Design a protein around this nucleic acid. Structure first.
Ligand SMILES: Nc1ncnc2c1ncn2[C@@H]1O[C@H](COP(=O)(O)NP(=O)(O)OP(=O)(O)O)[C@@H](O)[C@H]1O
Ligand SMILES: Nc1ncnc2c1ncn2[C@@H]1O[C@H](COP(=O)(O)NP(=O)(O)OP(=O)(O)O)[C@@H](O)[C@H]1O
Ligand SMILES: [Ca+2]
Ligand SMILES: [Ca+2]
Ligand SMILES: [Ca+2]
Ligand SMILES: [Ca+2]
Ligand SMILES: [Ca+2]
Ligand SMILES: [Ca+2]
Ligand SMILES: [Ca+2]
Ligand SMILES: [Mg+2]
Lengths: 937, 920
DNA sequence: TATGGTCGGA
DNA sequence: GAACTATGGTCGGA
RNA sequence: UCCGACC
RNA sequence: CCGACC
């Protein structure tokens, strides 16, 4: 099997030395990383090579790393450190805390070295990380799982090494390497059980974009493992057994093994475990809800009911504010949505499953097969916008195409004019701008994560937070240009997103989980939408929808019928179901199926009730799709059929399960064409300006089949794609990229395409006009306050020569740091900033005056008086010459100086808030409008 | 009463010739200053300053008067000088307060006058039509007052009352160069005299003529106009002479109601209905009293004019003679302005021709609903109609116990962590009002004046309530205060309850016992949240509630036909009698119903039919005399009509001044119905009718005096006996045996013990080594340097002096804030190269220099054991700075020095506290 | 040259 | 009179 | 940016 | 404490 590649695959993984054998897995994982990052061989015998008993009882990785850095070889900057909370859990928490599992992850990139006896792939072990748990991690232990991002062996990229590219069997060798046998790492033997497309990933600069694949490995055996439950005291278990426990293969040999394999993802879905129902509490339905017109169509695909008590515990376990009307989760073999039974008057727990939910035949015996696992809940809704895919369909199903082009166009101009007229007004008053910046972006996540506002050097990392921080210390956005420049860039970027993606905001629109009406109250083509709270659009708001038409759609939208106009009817029967949209269970075909072959197992619909967009819309009847069986080759080989090659009984089953793995790995590594065929359709439809003619329809079918590839077992290669383009699509093979893909109009004449018209005839003009009005509406870097300490020390320096020397050294040192500030490198923008900052913080007084300036009793010397003087000098010397340097390095001190300077006797008191307490305060809107009222009179 | 009259000859300040040419505003402000400084306005070189006419700040006018007070806001003066007294719908108000003159000397004014500053109130129809400058309002002590304070001159001589009324009504009163005639008077309630409480009456005056007025339009350019004509403009007396003149008098308030003018509808756009909606059962009962429909476009304008966030579903306002509520027509498919009026709304026959009688005037809009509670009037009625009285008691009591425990448990858990306690303190009280008013957190000395803010200020700088005793003691004091408030007042709060505007079903969708409630946003109870009410029984009631039928149980049905109507409750127009009438005789002109959907409170309720009310005609006599009858005395024609109108004013002023018995008769019913423990027996129903009629006194012309009250008690009640206060009116159970009345039981058997139990129920210390950082820092320097040591010693001694002063003024005892400030001034007095570093002159605020920190540090070090409250009240500010500095760790974030204003505008983020508390 | 969309960053 | 004796509720300002 | 689920 | 409202 291509022996050239096989040799370079002998030792890709780092070796585990005997000295590290008696180590906690976390310690083993972390220690190995530093060695790799420091170039030191783990088996190097020059070093002492003795285990430090002190490592077995640690809480910060820095302590473990420091003991090694004492050795000369390690003594380079430290690599990213596992957060202490994660580290403690790995050693003392059994890898699980609050439903979160520590994850062992790696990124593998091809070795630049082309030496024949050299590792084919260079390995980077990622720091221990906390991630949501899943069924398999909860059942067999989060430490028994290892995931990697490996470059796809079938990548047609120039950057691919030649050993693999030239060798014909190269693909088979790597695939065999992954699946044939165990892989050794940190004292554990890992076996592959699953693989999925990770998409195009940028090769790590530590070692041109290449498609990478995520492979999942289970720890079958380890040195600490025992033959036939804590982490370091687990029992051997073969992947063939784990998959059997998950899928119950005995009762599922009739499934196509490729599809069987794809259901392993259901054991890996990130979920919160809620509760374990008893067998007598579970209602397994034998038949799905069926069309009342005898078409046989299923009307409740993927959705079933759940008791009110089950919903209540969902709220209690997840700490929700209210009881969720519906949740997305997994239950044994069931995957889909569950909705509260509006008819439940009791307090008994019960949940039902339906055929369309149950993806394999399951017995629901083990506790873990009867635990309701929640992946998400129906929450408060946001306003949504449009996307490039709805636009042609909206234009194609319009009674008047011209009226639509104007309607959507007007939405764009008036949304932009609001966005700017609001920011321009706020910029006049600092309190109003602070409110706007918090309303623009929310950093609550990073604030909770760090327990403080994250700060890069001397200013907050986020530009939004930087603005608020400096304004909170007294800076006026229209008086200091540093703040203006930040608001300018932020506005330009938000406009650039509108230019590059045309996300035209529609206030009367949202994405809502789709649910079917179990109770037959909604007639065909009626939907029910009730909100949990007031849904606001400009000067109109809603708690429900009634007596009006709505537009529903799903992405991707390709067929003319992928958008559908229906009638919003509020049924008081359903009133308690909030933040979900309920399709009727009457009619020939479920409405969800009409939305791009959608269902009710987690699907979210685009819901739009904007009249100017809805009433021009006319429905299209679902299209008659072409037979593409000649090109789309389906592999329906069953598990049973695979087993016949080997026999019957345990060993035969066990062999067949490993066949399923490697066979599915091969099918999972086939080059994907969903991207190409989708982009081809965009170009062809654009050139013909048609999303409804014959070629447009077939391509919509092709992309509709390709997206379901891994679950339908569809083989599709370059050859078939070129064949389909010749036989059915008119022989054109390479089509021109559309004009909207470019940032400026490179077309001839007035734009003809709706996207081109909106991007170049409506958006870019309006963007440029509003930006100039915003510039015209708006300042000086200089601020006499920020130089108070300079003037104060110069005066002392003039009177005293002793102080003069310190001033000169400080000034000269600052210039050196500015020189360093003055380019892309392996070390990124943050690391470069920190290095310049470290020299900046290095400037130090280096005696009564020195003590008064250094204030060494303060632990954080960035809070002493010397820091205030150093920043003041820097501002005076480089406010104009280099503004970014004086601020990114001295902003926090300059803010302190401003708040000191702006304080007036008697008029209140400034407040030095702790980082943490500051990071937990939000602007009070009600305070803002009342204060502005007091100013108007 | 000759003695009273001689004292009534010269009540008002005199208008000298030198101020004749002065603008009204200037004259009023000058008069106020001279009175405040006690200077006669009628031989010094007091001469007109032409600078005053062009003035834009009253202080500039006042500055010119330096030859030897509260100030109108500058925007008001400008609107008064150059804005025609009207700005943005606000009208500048000429207000005065009168009080009995202390001196009893005869030939001296009976009343002492104080002109209040010029001020903004919302305008009304009358000010918008004839001009705010022509309106003057006074709070005067009632002549029919039995108070001991009433001066003997009035009390001892009867007939003084008639004289005081004659002074007010007979003719004009000269003030600031204008002739003022009384036109209206209403009860202002008991009001404390400015330097013992007495009942005062609001009297309204209109300027008929003046020095600047023209015989038959800027402020100084008015035209003569008699009150008899203004009222005739408002009420169209020619077409309303059929009305009882007292009721007609009562309608003058409609012209004085503070309202926001929205739009002026044209005559074609007005739909006057000749008949009200009536019962489908033939009773003849009105089912839409006070309520009509309006177009969606008129509603959208109300949002635009009032700056509302959404279109209101219903408004309370006045349109010509129409008073009441208007609701959006859910069936309005058009875009044309239209409004409708019904007989019940129209309190007089108006022609709807003048624009001011065709303007829609809004007082209030249906708005976001707030959770309510059970007032003490509802509890007896709930028990009277309870299927099982013992289960009602059990529920309301068990609910109360659960609520108290939840609150106490929340406070205790919060203290454990500073971020959580900050959230509880903010939830406890809101300082937004003080913050917006001062643009900062108000500070007394070195710490915020409010204890609640002081805790947040010091926790925001790193202090821990569990680790610093100063924070601990403040929190304990605050908790005790809340517990003491809870013991005094029994406030049972029910989350699933709210007061909501009552509307009627024009569209005939609701049945007799069905109501519809949709909310504008999520109504949150701790357990659940609602956007609407469906498939549950609710209780509806109105305050006052006295009769057993005054609370009713209905079925909440959500009708998609009414879905657009939000923040309102809609009653049925079907049935014999309207539901609103059952709630203390309620209507839909702005009545708000108490709505409860709490199943525990609702489930036991059994509805009672409306009672047959006794005939109290013997004690309650109504004056139904009509305007015509009044006119028949004077004849026919304009002149007769003119003095009939002035007669109505004088007769009504007397009626309006009749001592009111609503308070006492209500208090008596409470005391008697408590002794009887019955709100449904003979006397309770008697007293409910009595108070049910007394509230409608002014509109029904009911005469009721001590004599009638004495004989009503004598015959129908237990007369002449002074009824005691119920036990629950006291803070403790001074009664015999275990309490039995529902209120005594809930306050004394349920609330008191639970509150007391929490009150009965390594650690906190004054010391904090971080706070002595600067002191220890300067002792090291002082040990190796003399000059500094002398500075340190002098400073250390100087704080000693201030500490002694704090004992002299703040330890025990002109007012307390002044004393604290006096020490603070002495404290900030303590002040000094090295001196230049310690005292940063470039800082205007010396409290921000390094010296302020050292002085705070040594003061803490030297007196944290002995004088804690001194150290903090003077230096808490700097101690918080020091704490924030010391707690900062290299790389663990950056502290933020916030300004006072930007600090005062920030708020605890509930989402942060909850998320951070999770993950420890 | 190889898709769109919804969420989160335990 | 020494002593009798002044309502509930909804919302806003200061 | 990047990382991670989901349809 | 001041102001409308039922
Ligand atoms: N990567 C993707 N890009 C675009 N669309 C996607 C993608 N993944 C899923 N979808 C959409 O989600 C649909 C898949 O539906 P499901 O996720 O429900 N899978 P389904 O075929 O129904 O099989 P089951 O698991 O339910 O037995 C596709 O047809 C697409 O519409
Ligand atoms: N000061 C008050 N104290 C107690 N209850 C009051 C008070 N003012 C009004 N009310 C209540 O509101 C009712 C008055 O209703 P209205 O204000 O509707 N007057 P009404 O007699 O109907 O005459 P119209 O002007 O509507 O023709 C009283 O019966 C009480 O229930
Ligand atoms: Ca599908
Ligand atoms: Ca689906
Ligand atoms: Ca599905
Ligand atoms: Ca009323
Ligand atoms: Ca009424
Ligand atoms: Ca994607
Ligand atoms: Ca009152
Ligand atoms: Mg009534």
């Amino acid at each position: 099997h291509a022996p050239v590649v096989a040799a370079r695959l002998r030792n890709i993984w780092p070796k585990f030395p005997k000295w590290l054998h008696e180590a906690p897995l976390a310690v083993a994982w972390e220690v190995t990383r530093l060695f790799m990052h420091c170039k030191v061989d783990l088996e190097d015998e020059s070093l002492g090579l003795k285990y430090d008993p002190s490592w077995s009882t640690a809480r910060d990785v820095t302590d473990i790393w420091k003991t090694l850095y004492r050795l000369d070889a390690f003594r380079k900057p430290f690599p990213e450190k596992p957060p202490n909370d994660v580290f403690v859990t790995a050693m003392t928490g059994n890898f699980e805390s609050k439903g979160s599992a520590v994850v062992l992850s790696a990124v593998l990139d091809y070795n630049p070295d082309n030496s024949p006896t050299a590792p084919l792939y260079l390995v980077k072990l990622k720091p221990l990380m906390f991630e949501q748990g899943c069924r398999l991690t909860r059942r067999f232990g989060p430490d028994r799982f290892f995931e990697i991002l490996i470059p796809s062996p079938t990548s047609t990229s120039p950057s691919v090494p030649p050993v693999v590219s030239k060798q014909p069997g190269a693909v088979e060798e790597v695939i065999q390497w992954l699946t044939m046998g165990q892989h050794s790492l940190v004292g554990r033997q890992w076996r592959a059980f699953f693989a999925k497309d990770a998409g195009y990933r940028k090769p790590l600069r530590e070692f041109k974009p290449i498609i990478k694949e995520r492979v999942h490995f289970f720890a079958e055996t380890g040195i600490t493992f025992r033959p036939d439950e804590p982490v370091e005291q687990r029992t051997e278990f073969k992947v063939s057994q784990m998959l059997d426990w998950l899928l119950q293969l005995d009762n599922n040999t009739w499934q196509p093994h490729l599809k069987l394999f794809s259901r392993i993802q259901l054991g890996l879905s990130k979920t919160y475990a809620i509760m374990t129902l008893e067998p007598h509490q579970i209602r397994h339905h034998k038949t799905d809800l069926l069309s009342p017109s005898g078409t046989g169509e299923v009307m409740n695909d993927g959705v079933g009911r759940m008791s009110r008590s089950v919903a209540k515990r969902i709220r209690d376990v997840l700490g929700l504010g209210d009881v969720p009307s519906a949740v997305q989760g997994r239950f044994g073999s069931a995957k889909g949505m569950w909705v509260i039974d509006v008819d439940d008057t009791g307090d008994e727990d019960w949940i039902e499953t339906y055929p369309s939910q149950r993806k394999w035949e399951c017995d629901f015996v083990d506790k873990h097969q009867r635990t309701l696992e929640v992946r998400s809940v129906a929450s408060e809704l946001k306003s949504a916008g449009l996307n490039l895919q709805l636009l042609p369909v909206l234009e194609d199903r319009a009674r008047d195409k011209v009226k639509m082009r104007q309607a959507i166009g007007d939405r764009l101009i008036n949304d932009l004019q609001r966005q700017f007229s609001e920011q321009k007004h706020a910029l006049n008053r600092p309190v109003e701008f602070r409110q706007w910046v918090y309303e623009s972006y929310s950093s609550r996540a990073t604030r909770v994560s760090h327990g403080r506002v994250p700060f890069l050097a001397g200013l907050p990392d986020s530009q939004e937070e930087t603005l608020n921080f400096l304004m909170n210390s007294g800076f006026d956005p229209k008086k200091q240009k540093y703040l203006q420049d930040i608001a300018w860039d932020l506005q330009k970027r938000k406009c650039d997103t509108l230019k590059s993606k045309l996300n035209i905001r529609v206030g009367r629109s949202a994405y809502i989980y789709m649910i079917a009406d179990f109770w037959g109250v909604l007639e065909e083509n009626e939907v029910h939408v009730g909100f949990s709270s007031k849904f606001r659009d400009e000067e109109e708001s809603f708690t429900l929808l009634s007596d009006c038409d709505v537009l529903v759609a799903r992405s991707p939208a390709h067929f003319p019928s992928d958008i559908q106009r229906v009638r919003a009817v509020f049924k008081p029967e359903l009133h308690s179901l909030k933040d979900v949209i309920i399709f009727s269970t009457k009619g020939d075909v479920p409405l969800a199926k009409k939305l791009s072959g959608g269902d009710y197992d987690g699907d979210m619909a685009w819901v739009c009730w904007d009249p100017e967009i809805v009433d021009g819309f006319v429905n299209a009847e679902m299209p008659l799709e072409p037979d593409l069986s000649r090109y789309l080759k389906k592999d329906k080989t069953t598990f049973k059929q695979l087993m016949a090659s080997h026999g019957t009984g345990s060993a035969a089953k066990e062999q067949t399960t490993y066949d399923m793995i490697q066979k599915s790995f091969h099918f999972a590594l086939q080059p994907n064409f969903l991207g190409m065929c989708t982009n081809y359709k965009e170009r062809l439809c654009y050139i013909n300006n048609s999303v409804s003619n014959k070629p447009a329809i077939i391509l919509s079918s092709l992309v509709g089949n390709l997206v379901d590839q891994s679950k339908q077992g569809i083989v599709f290669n370059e050859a078939s794609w070129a064949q389909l383009r010749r036989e059915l699509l008119g022989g054109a093979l390479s089509l021109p990229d559309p004009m909207y893909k470019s940032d400026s109009w490179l077309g001839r004449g007035e734009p003809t395409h709706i996207i081109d018209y909106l991007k170049f005839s409506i958006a870019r003009p309006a963007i440029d006009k509003e930006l100039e009005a915003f510039h015209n509406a708006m300042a000086h870097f200089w601020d006499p306050d920020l130089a108070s300490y300079y003037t104060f020390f110069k005066e002392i320096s003039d009177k005293s020569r002793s102080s003069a020397l310190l001033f000169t050294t400080l000034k000269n040192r600052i210039g050196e740091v500015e020189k360093e500030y003055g380019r892309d490198s392996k070390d990124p923008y943050p690391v470069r900033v920190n290095q310049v900052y470290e020299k900046w913080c290095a400037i130090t007084p280096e005696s009564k005056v020195i003590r008064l300036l250094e204030l060494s009793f303060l632990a954080d010397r960035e809070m002493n008086t010397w820091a205030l003087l150093r920043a003041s000098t820097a501002f005076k010397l480089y406010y104009h010459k280099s503004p970014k340097f004086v601020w990114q390095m001295a902003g926090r001190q300059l803010a302190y100086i401003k708040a000191q300077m702006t304080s007036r006797p008697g008029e209140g008191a400034p407040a030095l808030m702790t980082a943490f307490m500051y990071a937990g305060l939000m602007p009070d809107k009600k305070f803002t409008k009342q204060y502005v009222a007091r100013l108007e009179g």
